[PDB]
Amino acid sequence: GVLNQVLNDNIRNGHVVNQLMEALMQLSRQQFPTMPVDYKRSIQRGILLL
Amino acid sequence: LVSTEAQIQKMSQDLQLEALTIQSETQFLTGINSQAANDCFKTLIAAMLS
Numbered sequence: 001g002v003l004n005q006v007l008n009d010n011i012r013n014g015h016v017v018n019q020l021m022e023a024l025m026q027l028s029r030q031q032f033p034t035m036p037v038d039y040k041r042s043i044q045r046g047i048l049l050l
Numbered sequence: 051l052v053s054t055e056a057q058i059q060k061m062s063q064d065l066q067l068e069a070l071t072i073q074s075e076t077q078f079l080t081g082i083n084s085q086a087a088n089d090c091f092k093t094l095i096a097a098m099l100s
Contacts, residue, residue: 038066 024050051084058082 010016028047032040058079062072072079 039064 021050051087054082054084 008016010019024047028044058072061079065076065078067075
């Protein structure tokens, strides 16, 4: 009787993180040319703690 | 204008300067004030009009 707002079935499982940590695990492997090397280190380190 | 201390501290992370010697290690950050920002905008508009 009460209209309540339900989350998706992937967030309720935990399967949405297996879509995230395969997206920012490939973004850590992509070497990128337009930035200095000390900028590549600071993104690749903080993406490793997560 | 954007404040000077909140701009040099953002600018000193990209250049990877040393601590306490942001003015002596590189000569990149010299004469960056707000007095000289207003002075240059005035002297570019007023030099073309006259």
